[PDB]
């Protein structure tokens with residue numbers, strides 16, 4: 296089959312009541328079942344609309360407020376899928392696996408692939424030199440059940456985010472895939488998307504067509520809003536992408552979507568309500584990739600579009616960019632820092648007076664809640680008119696752009712093209728990437744621009 300119905304669910308999760316000591320296994324199962332009822336409502340809706348696969352969010356079933364012991368009652372010992380097990384049909388094969396059983400049955404009775412995130416526990420002995428002192432590993436685990444309810448993939452999150460002290464890290468990164476009549480799929484979780492393993496190995500070495508992506512992502516503007524960066528990543532890596540995000544505006548958790556190599560196909564962003572949302576979209580089983588892009592070709596082919604600028608430092612996500620302020624309603628600007636030069640050409644729909652935009656270049660190591668080397672070229676709307684706010688989270692803008700064109704002398708080929716509009720809206724089909732590394736507008740933007748960014752990762756320099 297050449298196309299398939301993809302679904303993602305944004306889940307307003309029921310969080311376990313605050314308790315000082317760990318709950319019983321029955322209370323744990325009761326809370327997880329409260330979440331699975333809602334998730335099943337989504338799965339049934341997707342099946343009734345003919346979906347082939349549905350992704351649900353990270354931590355969607357038991358939440359994220361845990362220490363090791365208070366999490367333990369929620370864990371199940373999840374076997375390796377090579378055991379060839381359908382929990383729905385052979386319950387009791389392995390013992391105390393009710394959550395796996397219910398996920399299996401949801402996948403089977405609704406004839407739909409189900410991707411869910413749950414907790415794995417793996418007992419270990421002192422025989423094991425890295426057994427944790429409390430006698431077991433606990434892993435943040437994606438499980439996939441096929442349309443028959445078979446366990447076809449289990450993935451332990453490699454790159455733990457801060458505040459995940461309830462979990463352990465696998466001894467080695469797990470490259471987990473599963474094959475289907477509608478393509479080869481790879482899986483990783485939330486923070487993983489910012490690192491090489493497994494996320495980049497899946498695409499570059501195992502050539503998967505589609506990533507399934509449970510996430511509990513807290514938006515960090517201007518470059519790391521969920522929809523913005525996930526769709527940008529799918530575009531740069533050239534895969535389909537099913538991002539299923541928690542809904543929790545209080546913590547800036549919102550943004551779910553279905554993304555394709557050529558464009559975003561569906562997306563959701565909602566800070567106002569507490570409702571979940573099911574998204575569906577058609578995808579090609581095996582997409583085309585246009586010619587690969589040399590991200591520094593064009594940028595290395597110009598001389599600076601501007602010289603003797605008034606440059607200044609301004610802070611984006613604790614990273615200090617070198618900025619030049621955009622003064623004219625249209626202009627050609629170049630900005631450099633260390634090894635990275637960023638070129639912008641732009642014509643705004645109008646000069647909104649109390650709105651300031653800037654072009655910034657960053658080339659260095661990020662260290663706050665994550666260590667990773669970055670090369671970023673960004674056109675962005677400054678939070679206020681104060682140049683000290685250029686880089687701060689900005690959610691709204693009024694300046695639309697008639698045209699833009701951004702490029703950079705990137706020292707990496709992993710560069711993810713981002714375009715975000717006011718109110719955190721994607722711009723599907725309004726822009727393109729050329730083979731020589733320009734991200735440019737195909738027409739005037741449909742809404743005011745928050746950012747146009749080329750976000751590049753230099754994994755070797757971590």
Ligand SMILES: O=C(c1cnc(N2CC[C@H](O)C2)s1)N1CCC2(CCOCC2)C1
Pocket residue numbers: 353359456457458459484485486487511512513514515519664665
């Ligand atoms: O995977 C994640 C990420 C959430 N936001 C992330 N990023 C990436 C870029 C920027 O740093 C923002 S990663 N998890 C799982 C555990 C979690 C712990 C925090 O509280 C609740 C949920 C958060």
